[PDB]
Amino acid sequence: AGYDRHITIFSPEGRLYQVEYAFKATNQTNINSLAVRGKDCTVVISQKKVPDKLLDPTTVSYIFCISRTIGMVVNGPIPDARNAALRAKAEAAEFRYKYGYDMPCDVLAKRMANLSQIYTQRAYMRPLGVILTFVSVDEELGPSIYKTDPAGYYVGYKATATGPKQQEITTNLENHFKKSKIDHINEESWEKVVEFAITHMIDALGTEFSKNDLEVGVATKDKFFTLSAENIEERLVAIAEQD
Amino acid sequence: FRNNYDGDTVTFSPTGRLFQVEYALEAIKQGSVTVGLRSNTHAVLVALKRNADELSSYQKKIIKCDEHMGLSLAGLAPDARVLSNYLRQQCNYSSLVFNRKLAVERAGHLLCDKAQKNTQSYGGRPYGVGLLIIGYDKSGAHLLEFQPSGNVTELYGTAIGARSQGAKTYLERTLDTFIKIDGNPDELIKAGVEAISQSLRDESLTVDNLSIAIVGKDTPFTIYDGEAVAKYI
Amino acid sequence: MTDRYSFSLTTFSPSGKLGQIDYALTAVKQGVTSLGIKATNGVVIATEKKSSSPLAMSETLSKVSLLTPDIGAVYSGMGPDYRVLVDKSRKVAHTSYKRIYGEYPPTKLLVSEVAKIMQEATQSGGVRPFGVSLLIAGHDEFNGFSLYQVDPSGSYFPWKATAIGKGSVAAKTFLEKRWNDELELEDAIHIALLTLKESVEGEFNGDTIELAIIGDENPDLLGYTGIPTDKGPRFRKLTSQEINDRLEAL
Amino acid sequence: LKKGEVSLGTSIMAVTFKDGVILGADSRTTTGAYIANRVTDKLTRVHDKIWCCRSGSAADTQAIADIVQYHLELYTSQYGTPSTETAASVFKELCYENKDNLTAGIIVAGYDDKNKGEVYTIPLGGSVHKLPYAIAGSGSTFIYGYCDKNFRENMSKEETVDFIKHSLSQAIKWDGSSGGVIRMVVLTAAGVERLIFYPDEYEQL
Amino acid sequence: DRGVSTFSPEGRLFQVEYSLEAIKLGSTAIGIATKEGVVLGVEKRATSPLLESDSIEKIVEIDRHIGCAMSGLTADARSMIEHARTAAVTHNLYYDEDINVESLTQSVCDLALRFGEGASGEERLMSRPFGVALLIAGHDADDGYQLFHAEPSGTFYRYNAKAIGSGSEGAQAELLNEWHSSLTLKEAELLVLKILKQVMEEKLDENNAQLSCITKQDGFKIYDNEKTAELIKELKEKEAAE
Amino acid sequence: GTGYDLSNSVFSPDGRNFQVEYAVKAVENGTTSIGIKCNDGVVFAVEKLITSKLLVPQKNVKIQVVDRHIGCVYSGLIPDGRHLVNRGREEAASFKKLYKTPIPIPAFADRLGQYVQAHTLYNSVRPFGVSTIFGGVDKNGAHLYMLEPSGSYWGYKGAATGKGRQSAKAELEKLVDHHPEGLSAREAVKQAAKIIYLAHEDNKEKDFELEISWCSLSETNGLHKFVKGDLLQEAIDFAQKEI
Amino acid sequence: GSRRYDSRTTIFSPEGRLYQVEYALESISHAGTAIGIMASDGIVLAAERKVTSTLLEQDTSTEKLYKLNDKIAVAVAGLTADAEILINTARIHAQNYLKTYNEDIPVEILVRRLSDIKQGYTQHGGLRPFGVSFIYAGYDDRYGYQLYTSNPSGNYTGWKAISVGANTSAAQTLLQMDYKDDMKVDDAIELALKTLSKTTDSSALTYDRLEFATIRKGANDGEVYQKIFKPQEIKDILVKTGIT
Amino acid sequence: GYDRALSIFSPDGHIFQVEYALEAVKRGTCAVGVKGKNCVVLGCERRSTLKLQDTRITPSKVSKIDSHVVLSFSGLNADSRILIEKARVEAQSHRLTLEDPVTVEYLTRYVAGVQQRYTQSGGVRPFGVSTLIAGFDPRDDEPKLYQTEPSGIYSSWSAQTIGRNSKTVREFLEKNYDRKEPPATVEECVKLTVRSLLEVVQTGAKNIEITVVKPDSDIVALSSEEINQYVTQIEQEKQEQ
Amino acid sequence: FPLPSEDSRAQILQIHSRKMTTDDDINWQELARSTDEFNGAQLKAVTVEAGMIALRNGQSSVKHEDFVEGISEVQARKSKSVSFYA
């Protein structure tokens, strides 16, 4: 009777309560993150929020590196994030061992989506309270972004966004693609797409970020790395001087 | 009372406790009363046996583990055989592999690991039997107090049972006495007899109701039942 | 640990039905509205691609998957429940046929295996039924073109033309007078476009509509020549420019 | 060793020096009597800074070499950057339980920013030890005399190549099972550099 | 509706706690342990005159020197005797001797704790604990004649005179002043039937009661209907005298 | 409907988990323990509340050591704290078998992070209501981590938990601002006992016992051991002098 | 806690019966009807599909009558999904008897195999019982023509004329009064056809919603002929019965 | 599979699963039987609610376990098949293992022993079927009639009935029948069984099924014409007396 | 307001006895250990039950065994009533 909202089963309204309650657990940290696709690569930027001085900023990271060719950005609680991070690395390395080569971005988002559904369709386990966003550059489609969800449905986006202000970030970034009629940024250098996403991020969020207030992942072709506090601060200085 | 979560051990209370763990502690509180203490070179346990009739017998509250160590029974009687079997296997496992006697300090962590698996998973239950682990090793005599909650702490002596905590006052005033008694098993056991006498309410200590077991360096673990304890009454 | 729920989540209601399946059909009637039609020269299926975000890429989403080269599938239900079902549908198709009989199963024998996975989830404990309804349509060398409608309850029925979704009430009634005994492959495409266009509340183009038809065996889409036995797969999906060709044809 | 299985053997070696370590091998693989593949390569990359060669049964090496790539890939992303001692222990456990079914020689050598170059050779038994120079296979059986006397500690890059080029020349002319072009990889603070020779070069001295 | 391992605020378990009250729902088994032997008896409790006396047997034989009796629900009694006879005879194979009466009781009483759902570490499958009470009697070469009681709680007591079932209160109180260490074997047989005459609903005869005995020489023995009928006639002389 | 708090995997409509929140409340009902991170290592400290005079001094080990250089201290239920150490010991032993050289501090946190999270996904088992503080000297620098009942953790320059967690954590911020450049391992030993006495105002109604164990490369050289001899009594007189 | 979400599918009611079994019997009345008659020279089977339309495909389709053997045909009254599980296992066991003893399987052995499967989920497994019922029809040299039926409880006996489906008591009334021991195969088709016309929910009666599979024995003895009537052959008998 | 224990003790000491299972018998067909000197008879009724049941292809209410021993069940006709099939396998197993034909006492302890397992096994439910096992042991002419209750308790009875209207037939078997003096002929055993079914079947013929068991592996089931012969003679001596 | 500690319950239980009459031989710190996780309301009921025992026994003053027996009497988490599990 009243157990329809406890374990996942068909509801009298034709919905799933636990799936809908899972989206409310992704914003627990309240971190806005956006990623735009450059010409030859894709850049992602996420908020770095350190509540207490006892926390080491270098150790705190919301962006995990699955492989050299595949980055991952997670918005949500870290315990459910690290549980899916250690699991995604096991399935990503299994592809190189079994199939011989490196997995693209669309397949990794597909396998984790079907795995996230096992956390849903099965009544004795719960779905993950995190949203896995993979950033990678493939050898065919090139730059691509695929966003997962606790329901297990992966879909590609042009400029992905998250957080409580996502509605303000998506609307602000929508006017750029509709006006230019382009599916990706025409900037060839990976340094230009970093400063381009920061400009639209500050105006949408209405906040001036500092060196420790952001974590900027950079996914290039066959290489992935995370910018340190010195590289992020260097980009912020050049923006205020030029613009 | 009898509300909130009585169903399972894997559900936490809103106050930060566990009812099933607290209910298991009530078995020892209302169970058979027993006391105990130890010295540097020796350790003595005293138990009070009960029964349901005068014509019946009195079950032993002390089960022998090995020659150098033993335990005591309190709270739930039948659950003692389960932990006693797993404890005697670990004592023989160390002799057949490491060829060493199981230390008292390491014996407390073994029983703590067995009871923690039932509390953290459905289908199991914490054993509500009390256990007083005594023994002698190269370090010295040691005594432990086992609880279903998993608390293991070395003490000079303690009491678990019905109105057993009322007998701990005699152990505190005499705390500086029996610890300095070494090589005198006669006067050391009399210290435990006077301790349980403070917890006597309805009846007193008799021949069949008094069970005393002593362990030490020159004297191994020996259970004294029947008329063997009549001299210490 | 493992799984402590062995009991069936689907129980018989006092009215003589199952509560999980009765509410499963509600999730099918509310969602993406698909359709399908069968003709003499082929089978034409179509569906609408909804846009959750204006920046979403429609090319990365395949609404019409491929079970066997001669058989397509379309779903009006939730995305995740379709992928796991089809991923398990290709395994039972290759294991029970390609690894035994050596050829691909026909349309009638494949729908029995696909519905076999869904009917087990409605009984065995620890799992819930699938809230999706698949339309299995294909062609063989004997029975010919056939289209089956797989319900979430696990039962399948053949249909000349059918539509499932939000407009399943209006579209299915329209297909009664829009279908006859003689139709071509291209003639049934215009029927699918006139029916789906009335159900499109968003932008109308080839990117938001997935149109897949089953025609004659195509040697160009096969990938190799020189073998007269295999002339290529009959299943084909029209690209974005190819769908826009027949939209203005109405 | 079965009867009819593909084997590698020949000669594989690595020599440490000040600026790094340089490995070496040949392209010849002798299967039974004839030579199955003369253009092949015995080098295997489990990491950018960690290299390993292959000797003994070819079916045993190529299977173990792929398993190590799966363990270190999990070790690289989760734990951290691997070292020469960590990667050498993965081949060790695979040659222990599988020692009966899988018997092959393994030589692992890599570069690090702390310990510089290190060479860890694994014989058919599965032991792991630290040596400045290590040789294995059927071709290297004849070079034990030349490699021991002419070896020096903390050499240069040009002296290391000439030491291996002259060493592998004796393992070829004197043993028919080894031959072909000499493939060598260089590990320095800069990066990975490939080096290959030709039979008309090292044979002329 | 809850688990079988659920504890109570009283400090005890659910389930088994109720099994103790289920003993009074059955017949009344009475026995007395003397120095010359142990006399056991049960109550057939025939609800219809067409029931055969030799049909219902509440006293089984585990060993020639060891025997017991059942009371209450007899569905769980058969499952315990199968293991009780096994553990006693299998012990004869290992040690080439007869297992002690006290040692056998500890192995039988361990079956009451086997209830649980999804036990970890081993396979123990039981839906409900045994709701039957068994009085374990026998004789050994050390302590002598012993009479135990197998409780569903998992514990056991050695009784000189024990009355279980519906006579656990009224019939048990009479055993206090009627028992003595010098009580012989012949006088103990009439003492058991003395209580069985009052506690029985109908008249006492050979068809409504079956008694057994355990001695040192003959061991376990079941009284014949002719032997039982002779004790009923002698019981009437002991009742009305002066 | 009621019952959101009955089970574990059931998500609340607000986006939280009752079984996780109630497990955090059990952390503040136990004995307090703190920690201090240094340049060459970390320092652990714990205050064990003495019940009666029957307790034998220094026979109760609050800080359990995993492998050698990895120390562990927990505040909460006793069996839940000892189970994580016993499980972490098997993870450190199984690692050295295949992977040779011992596991570092940041890698060991992933073993307990996924293990505790596995308990919250299933209703068959319960999470850990104990907060485990583990750390030591790894291959590069040093790290310190505090395992929360939810499984969330980060790098901690200082750690505070238990009944006195409120007043103990406030003193950790003063130590960071006192020595922002670095702190020696010998000075942190006396500072660890001083913070315990400052947090003893809440626990002052009972008897206390000081237990301190530190690990660094300056003296022990990669060995985690307790404090015995005149070094323990020296830190007591120095900390009680300011009172 | 696994005790709360478990509805206890199999338990004894205070009245001494089963809950889910009684609820599964109601699903038969809400599903398509199935009627069959055992004649002297054969057995005539009939059924009706529920919720049909014009867009349905009547070319080759049967949602009720299935063929488990050359000499044995069945009928499905109930949920179709629960039938496909037993139909697959029935063809396995029927061929296993032929795989072992190298002879045709009778009906009684085939019924009890699937009946024991239904009894397994009711006695144990903690799952729901099968909401599908079957009507078994075949012929052998032992008892001759055999006509049985099944229930979710797993109990089966022989029946000369049985009706399982919508309007159970309504169809069995007309079949009992007109039943005759000398009724042949041609006369049994008319009795089964006229019952579906009066007991249906529609006005007229077409050949699209009717399904008939009979059993006939010609000059060849020892092997019967199992033929499912196609819609071309169904409209032919409609004129002979007078319904048209 | 399903490990949850269905059987739970009631606070009074009874069991809900065992107590409610006894009512499946009281709602089933009445199974009554008697035993004479050299013979034993087991009768049973049939439900008259539904007609047009072919007698030949209908499974008999009294199932044959072996040549010298049979079984007569009642109550639920579904769960009775599980007990009959497992008893017939044990009949061939005990014949194979000990090289001895099965007896009536061993077969009763096996059928009752299987029922005691499901009550003690977590995840299963007890049988709501009560079976009456009767037969003749090898080289023994004495009939053994043992009752098997759903609770797992077995007992011997000279004349006993189970099913609906049991209290009516039991009072009839305690007066007109004597346990100490059973009839010495087979005809008197058949006439007594028919009279016991007249208070339940209530003037019916095809609904009465009587199976006569004889020693030396002889089983003769009375047909519909042979049962009606005894009914005619009893009705003439009933209303007229 | 967390549950009172050992020394906290010893002070609370002693104040409720200020209006009573005893011999001052009662150890309140000993009674605090017999009370395991009891609130302020459950502590007041101990002094109430202790006064009722002296009325039945006819004692002119409340002694130490009255408080110990009052805990064994039914107040909170107490059942007894001839229930023995052995």
Side-chain angles (χ1 to χ4, degrees), chain A residues 73-86:
Chain A
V73 176
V74 178
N75 189 31
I78 194 66
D80 290 344
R82 294 183 181 276
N83 190 30
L86 296 175

Side-chain angles (χ1 to χ4, degrees), chain C residues 95-177:
Chain C
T95 299
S96 296
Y97 295 92
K98 299 301 288 184
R99 293 182 182 175
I100 294 171
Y101 296 93
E103 63 184 343
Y104 295 95
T107 301
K108 180 178 75 179
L109 274 66
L110 178 62
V111 63
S112 296
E113 295 301 321
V114 175
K116 184 178 179 180
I117 296 170
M118 294 177 71
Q119 64 182 19
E120 293 177 350
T122 60
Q123 184 174 355
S124 178
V127 299
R128 65 182 181 88
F130 296 96
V132 296
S133 178
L134 275 66
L135 296 175
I136 295 171
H139 182 63
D140 59 353
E141 295 301 321
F142 296 97
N143 291 336
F145 296 96
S146 179
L147 188 147
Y148 294 94
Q149 183 175 354
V150 176
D151 290 344
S153 63
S155 178
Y156 63 91
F157 298 96
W159 292 94
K160 301 298 184 181
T162 188
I164 55 174
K166 293 177 179 177
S168 64
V169 176
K172 183 178 179 180
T173 300
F174 295 160
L175 295 175
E176 294 178 350
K177 294 177 179 177

Side-chain angles (χ1 to χ4, degrees), chain B residues 1-2 17 19 22-23 25-31 52 75-78 163 165-167 169 172 201, chain I residues 3 6 27 30 33-38 64-65 68-70 72-73 75 77-80 84-86:
Chain B
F1 59 89
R2 298 174 64 185
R17 300 289 182 269
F19 295 99
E22 293 178 350
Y23 296 143
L25 295 174
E26 296 301 321
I28 295 171
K29 294 177 179 177
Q30 294 179 337
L76 296 173
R163 295 182 182 175
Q165 293 177 336
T169 300
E172 293 178 350
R201 300 289 182 268
Chain I
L3 296 175
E6 182 179 1
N27 189 340
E30 182 179 2
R33 295 182 183 175
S34 296
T35 59
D36 186 4
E37 294 178 350
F38 293 163
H64 182 62
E65 70 279 4
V68 176
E69 183 178 2
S72 64
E73 295 301 321
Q75 295 300 321
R77 300 289 184 269
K78 302 300 182 181
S79 178
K80 58 187 183 70
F84 58 93
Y85 59 90

Side-chain angles (χ1 to χ4, degrees), chain B residues 68-69 87 91 94 100-110 133 135-139 142 144:
Chain B
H68 62 285
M69 66 175 284
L87 178 62
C91 296
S94 63
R100 60 176 182 183
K101 294 176 179 177
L102 178 62
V104 176
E105 294 178 351
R106 292 192 297 273
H109 300 291
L110 295 175
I133 295 170
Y136 177 78
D137 59 353
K138 294 183 175 74
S139 64
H142 301 291
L144 295 175

Side-chain angles (χ1 to χ4, degrees), chain A residues 10 114 117 121 123 154 156 158, chain C residues 20 55 57 80-81 83 87:
Chain A
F10 295 97
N114 291 337
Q117 185 174 355
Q121 186 174 355
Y154 65 93
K158 294 176 180 177
Chain C
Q20 294 300 321
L55 296 175
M57 295 300 294
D81 289 344
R83 296 183 181 276
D87 289 344

Side-chain angles (χ1 to χ4, degrees), chain G:
Chain G
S2 63
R3 64 182 182 89
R4 292 188 298 274
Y5 299 94
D6 186 4
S7 64
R8 293 192 299 275
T9 59
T10 60
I11 55 172
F12 294 97
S13 63
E15 294 177 350
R17 293 174 296 180
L18 297 175
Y19 294 94
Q20 296 300 321
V21 175
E22 293 177 350
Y23 296 140
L25 294 174
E26 184 67 15
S27 63
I28 296 171
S29 63
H30 299 291
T33 187
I35 295 171
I37 295 170
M38 176 178 71
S40 63
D41 291 344
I43 295 170
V44 176
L45 296 175
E48 183 178 2
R49 292 193 297 273
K50 184 180 172 63
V51 182
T52 59
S53 178
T54 301
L55 297 174
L56 179 64
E57 180 179 2
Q58 295 85 1
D59 187 5
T60 59
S61 178
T62 303
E63 296 302 321
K64 303 300 183 181
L65 298 173
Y66 293 92
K67 183 178 179 180
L68 297 175
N69 190 340
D70 290 344
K71 294 177 179 177
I72 295 171
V74 297
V76 174
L79 177 63
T80 301
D82 290 344
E84 296 301 321
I85 295 170
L86 294 175
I87 293 170
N88 290 337
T89 60
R91 294 182 182 175
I92 293 170
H93 182 64
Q95 294 300 321
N96 287 337
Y97 178 79
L98 178 63
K99 183 179 179 180
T100 299
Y101 296 92
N102 193 30
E103 63 183 343
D104 290 344
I105 182 169
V107 177
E108 183 178 2
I109 295 171
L110 178 63
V111 175
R112 62 182 297 174
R113 179 60 179 165
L114 297 176
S115 296
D116 290 344
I117 295 170
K118 294 177 179 178
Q119 295 176 337
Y121 294 93
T122 59
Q123 293 177 336
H124 61 78
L127 296 175
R128 64 181 181 88
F130 294 157
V132 62
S133 63
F134 296 95
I135 294 171
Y136 298 90
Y139 175 77
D140 59 9
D141 290 344
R142 182 180 63 196
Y143 293 95
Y145 295 94
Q146 294 177 335
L147 178 63
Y148 294 93
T149 188
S150 65
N151 61 345
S153 179
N155 191 29
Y156 65 93
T157 57
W159 291 92
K160 294 176 179 177
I162 190 65
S163 177
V164 176
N167 291 336
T168 299
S169 63
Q172 293 177 336
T173 299
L174 296 175
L175 295 175
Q176 185 174 355
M177 294 183 286
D178 291 344
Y179 177 77
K180 294 177 179 177
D181 291 344
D182 59 353
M183 183 176 285
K184 294 177 179 177
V185 176
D186 291 344
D187 291 344
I189 295 170
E190 294 178 351
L191 177 61
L193 189 147
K194 293 176 179 177
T195 300
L196 295 174
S197 63
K198 294 177 179 177
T199 58
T200 188
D201 58 353
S202 63
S203 178
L205 178 63
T206 59
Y207 63 91
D208 290 344
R209 294 178 179 84
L210 295 175
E211 294 177 350
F212 296 96
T214 60
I215 294 170
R216 294 183 181 276
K217 183 178 179 180
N220 189 340
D221 291 344
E223 182 178 2
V224 297
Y225 295 93
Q226 184 64 59
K227 294 176 179 177
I228 295 171
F229 294 160
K230 294 177 179 177
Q232 294 177 336
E233 294 178 351
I234 295 170
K235 63 182 178 181
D236 291 344
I237 61 172
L238 295 174
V239 177
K240 294 176 179 177
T241 59
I243 303 301
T244 300

